[PDB]
Design a protein around this ligand. Structure first.
Ligand SMILES: NC(=O)c1ccc[n+]([C@@H]2O[C@H](COP(=O)([O-])OP(=O)(O)OC[C@H]3O[C@@H](n4cnc5c(N)ncnc54)[C@H](O)[C@@H]3O)[C@@H](O)[C@H]2O)c1
Ligand SMILES: NC(=O)c1ccc[n+]([C@@H]2O[C@H](COP(=O)([O-])OP(=O)(O)OC[C@H]3O[C@@H](n4cnc5c(N)ncnc54)[C@H](O)[C@@H]3O)[C@@H](O)[C@H]2O)c1
Ligand SMILES: NC(=O)c1ccc[n+]([C@@H]2O[C@H](COP(=O)([O-])OP(=O)(O)OC[C@H]3O[C@@H](n4cnc5c(N)ncnc54)[C@H](O)[C@@H]3O)[C@@H](O)[C@H]2O)c1
Ligand SMILES: NC(=O)c1ccc[n+]([C@@H]2O[C@H](COP(=O)([O-])OP(=O)(O)OC[C@H]3O[C@@H](n4cnc5c(N)ncnc54)[C@H](O)[C@@H]3O)[C@@H](O)[C@H]2O)c1
Ligand SMILES: [Cl-]
Ligand SMILES: [Cl-]
Ligand SMILES: [Cl-]
Ligand SMILES: [Cl-]
Ligand code: NA
Ligand code: NA
Ligand code: NA
Ligand code: NA
Lengths: 300, 298, 300, 298
């Protein structure tokens, strides 16, 4: 069977195992540095299988050797201090897991997302197409959710593309969002759409402020699981993913959220959308912020 | 209790619709037909597949309209794969089924689609929003399939809207189709897209020419079942369906394929697209043809 | 649409919302006394809907008025002191939610399960068939999981019935467990089967010891969600549920885990299995322990 | 890449099997038939239903065996709904398909089932564990359906094992059927159970008598698709299937319906039930009949 290793069995990691288990895509290995945590969550989820009817081997471990020969490696072990702390963790996870699964596609979740994905590429030495980051699917999901709510339509009929990174680094593109092929601008007035775009930018913080302790995990995990499925089933999904750029949108040597075709080979194509002056202004300012974070990381 | 769906006409499309619905576990299914044994056999066969698929659906076959009473949704797939023959079949089906399920949403499938839906509305006397026809979901599905195949992307990421009726009456709208929010024109060039539009127009005939002895049913049934689901779960799906127009697109007193929000109340909203002059030219010509068929019906 | 209210948006409650949301059974209301917690988890899960493709209205609240007219009420707000603390919480939740949803089926999860279900029946005044407790489905799930693992077969082909309550109160019945209709005893030797039965009894504690902080939730939530689905779809599931007895197995005026047919009417039938001398010895000792807990509760 | 499933014979059972499998999103599906247009039409029709159902499955139709190369699973549903006609059809199908997919697990559906599976084993020369036949899953499904209907419980909670072949060759085993681990005898009395056993024996004929012009396909296809899934996902399902026996139940050199653990390796284990003398009497008589058909084949 296919093999998926999730490094970091916290809220996002365990929830990702939950979403994946129900899909019955393959074996799942939950790894963490804390003893008992992954073993307990994995066994708990495994014991729910007879009820849900899925046949999935879900195991927990503290030994990287158990992640060997994985088809996909999901990294959810993350916690300038933020960059340093996460850089050290990401470094540790990738330097230990990558060598054991040379043919795997690595999907980063740790924040700062774009920067941590860049670091994972460096440490793993994997072809850039096989090291990607999850950020855009979650952000587009919030946007799509708000649009469906406001427009009064099924979430299954709303599509949307966006780029960049989190919050201020986010590059919203309402022009590239539709409901059953019809522009979203036809359903929602400019003023309200602007509010929705703003709510999207602050989407992660909105959850953090409500939970008081901890950040979002159901949607982030769902986003991550969808990307894992895309690779495993070679589905050719068109989605915004953190990818390594070599000229697209005028950006070079940097991980940035862009539209891609995701399949068995990881990033199989980076789409280059013809953005107008206003949208490019947004992307340039975003790339500036992402670049700044990337530089801070390189100076560590 | 559970929701109740009655499928009138247990042929290829009707039986296949029962198959798609059963797997969805949306509620009881009653397959009715004028031919004895046929609906009973297909219904029992499908029911016997339930322990394998793990779904709890009571699917039964019958020749008695009394068994369709109090249905939440009535699907009509009894037509013969022309206006006269189907007009009589449709009137007979609706006249017997409608009175027994006064709160049901009727989904017409019989061809000529737009015209038969109009007839069902007349005979049933049901509020217009609760009498609709399936046509556009199937045609948009063929279009989306071709786009997905050509672009090399998941069908889950392709969406499209179109209007009108079948074949020459279809009103393609490539401008209103996207892949994850991105215009299809970004993936497929003009000439190739035009070929896909043409293949979509001839989509039904393409399957007919291949099967030789009948018409399509897997996709037509899937489309029909998706509309049934939209109603039963009040999903508010945005899809092209045959609806009664009262001024939209400049059309009155006519059933025509238009974008709608489909839910428990049936057509809960008819969307008004900002069609350009080229697209409007196609729509007007289509309406003229649909109008012609309607006149012949009256 | 159907309406499900989950009282107590903690690990079990939020996870139950997750399992239910994917089933697309109806609207879900997550309620908690803590501000922000339910609103955050509900919104997080709602934002995952466009990714998973399900249309489910998931909302969080601190106002019981938002649970009015629910089809099913799930209680997962629980924390002699244990009985008292949980008795007070259960009392508060039921006395406030029951009056607002007079036609709902109440499914208790709070521990001590059997006793808390009994209390919910008293406080709600609902017909006993409409007040049940989840315990047996989870326990049978662990048992079935261990059997599938050992026998080397799909979890979809293992069935098992058991009675009583948790741990020492559990009444295992290997004789009433099969794989595609074949007795489990045909696949697993007596010594090993005994170990599996023992592992089942300690199943909850095994997870607690691994997690160190907190108890199981994936399987408990799955068990709860399966019971909710049984009521909403009037599925007539045959499962062990905490029900009110009036003579079955020689027990009267007590909630105890027994085999039932679960549907729209809640408990539609309490099956009376012909247990042998050995099994009855187990059930009597269990009923003694459950009774003791029930008495402690009545003396509060 | 994806898994590849080839279905030889695009008739009712074959096309319906493609339908069940497509919804499962297990891998590519190739529908092959000797009749031109038929497989192509059904495959394209089903493919066009994918954007509606939201599944990514490449389903294609063909008349060329070359398109079935390197399949993980080969389903054979080409037989005519007797030994001679199907023996020739089966030999032709296996002789052409087997060499192109040397690592595939062959699942026979053609009747006479046990005999045709034996023939497929001979012609393919494949390890016996990788050549099996579908028969028991369907019969057990009918039985489980009747039990569920009679007991008033979910089909998800009913499980049962049976052996042998079709109709008079079937070896019912009510003793080995339960509802959530509880013996069926606890819910249904002896006489009623006997009636259900008889209805199960005649289950196939019951559908035939109703349809009038053909045999069952929804449940037969579901059963076949479930076996395909078991192999592709190495699910280790415990089910009755036609397997090659080397001493089990005292039977040698014969294909017979027996309980097995079905996975990626095909039959990964043949279970040996502790049958009493009554049940063994039924099995011996059944084996005698299956043996008779086998002799006629040789
Ligand atoms: N990209 C997105 O869209 C997105 C969305 C949400 C959260 N995130 C990020 O994902 C990360 C995880 O969030 P969370 O809420 O699940 O956190 P968490 O604290 O619940 O879980 C992280 C887990 O990682 C484990 N861990 C730490 N160091 C490790 C190491 N070296 N190896 C293996 N395991 C290790 C911890 O012990 C812990 O169980 C954070 O960086 C967070 O900011 C990203
Ligand atoms: N709108 C679309 O997108 C679309 C797509 C495909 C087919 N169709 C149309 O759907 C209809 C059915 O196609 P089919 O391939 O399933 O046909 P079919 O001939 O296989 O089945 C029709 C069934 O209707 C039954 N029937 C006839 N009169 C009846 C009556 N008065 N009451 C009850 N049952 C009656 C027949 O006995 C038959 O079993 C045709 O009109 C066809 O053109 C529409
Ligand atoms: N029956 C079983 O098989 C089973 C299995 C596991 C856990 N449980 C039990 O389920 C309960 C919940 O476990 P958990 O891990 O989810 O706990 P938890 O502490 O994570 O969550 C309980 C939630 O209830 C809320 N709460 C407290 N008082 C409340 C009130 N009056 N009204 C509304 N909300 C209130 C809390 O604020 C908290 O968010 C416990 O009693 C536990 O022992 C039962
Ligand atoms: N084992 C079971 O439980 C079970 C249940 C039902 C039916 N069956 C059997 O399955 C078979 C198919 O039943 P059906 O109803 O689908 O029949 P059908 O007649 O509808 O379809 C058979 C298809 O096989 C094709 N075919 C014939 N020779 C071929 C060859 N050499 N190569 C490729 N394709 C060829 C035909 O052209 C036809 O489309 C029959 O033998 C039937 O008795 C078995
Ligand atoms: Cl960054
Ligand atoms: Cl028309
Ligand atoms: Cl108790
Ligand atoms: Cl035979
Ligand atoms: Na999926
Ligand atoms: Na068919
Ligand atoms: Na079908
Ligand atoms: Na279910």
């Amino acid at each position: 069977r296919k093999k998926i290793s999730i490094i970091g069995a916290g809220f996002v990691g365990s929830t990702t195992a939950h979403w994946l288990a129900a899909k019955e895509l393959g074996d799942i290995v939950l790894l963490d540095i804390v003893e008992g945590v992954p073993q307990g969550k994995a066994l708990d989820l495994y014991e729910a299988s007879p009820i849900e009817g899925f046949d999935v081997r879900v195991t927990g471990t503290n030994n990287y050797a158990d992640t060997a020969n994985s088809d996909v490696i999901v990294v959810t072990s993350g916690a300038e201090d933020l960059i340093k702390v996460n850089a050290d963790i990401t470094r540790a996870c990738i330097s230990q897991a990558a060598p054991l699964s040379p043919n795997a596609v690595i999907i980063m979740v740790n924040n700062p997302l774009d920067a941590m994905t860049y670091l994972a590429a460096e440490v793993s030495g994997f072809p850039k197409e096989r090291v990607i980051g999850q950020a855009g699917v979650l952000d587009a999901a919030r946007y799509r959710t708000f649009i469906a709510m406001e427009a009064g339509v099924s979430v299954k009929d709303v599509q949307a593309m966006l780029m960049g990174g989190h919050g201020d680094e986010m590059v919203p593109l309402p022009r590239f969002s539709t409901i059953s092929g019809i522009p979203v601008s036809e359903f929602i007035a400019p003023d309200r759409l602007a509010q929705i775009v703003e709510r999207t930018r602050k989407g992660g913080g909105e959850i953090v402020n409500l939970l008081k302790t901890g950040s979002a995990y159901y949607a982030p995990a769902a986003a991550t699981a969808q990307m894992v499925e895309a690779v495993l089933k070679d589905k050719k999904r068109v989605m915004p993913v953190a990818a390594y750029l070599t000229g697209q949108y005028g950006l070079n040597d940097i991980y940035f959220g862009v539209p891609v075709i995701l399949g068995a080979g990881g990033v199989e194509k980076i789409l280059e959308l013809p953005l107008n002056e206003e949208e490019m202004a947004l992307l340039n300012a975003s790339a500036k912020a992402v670049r700044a974070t990337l530089d801070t990381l390189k100076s560590l």
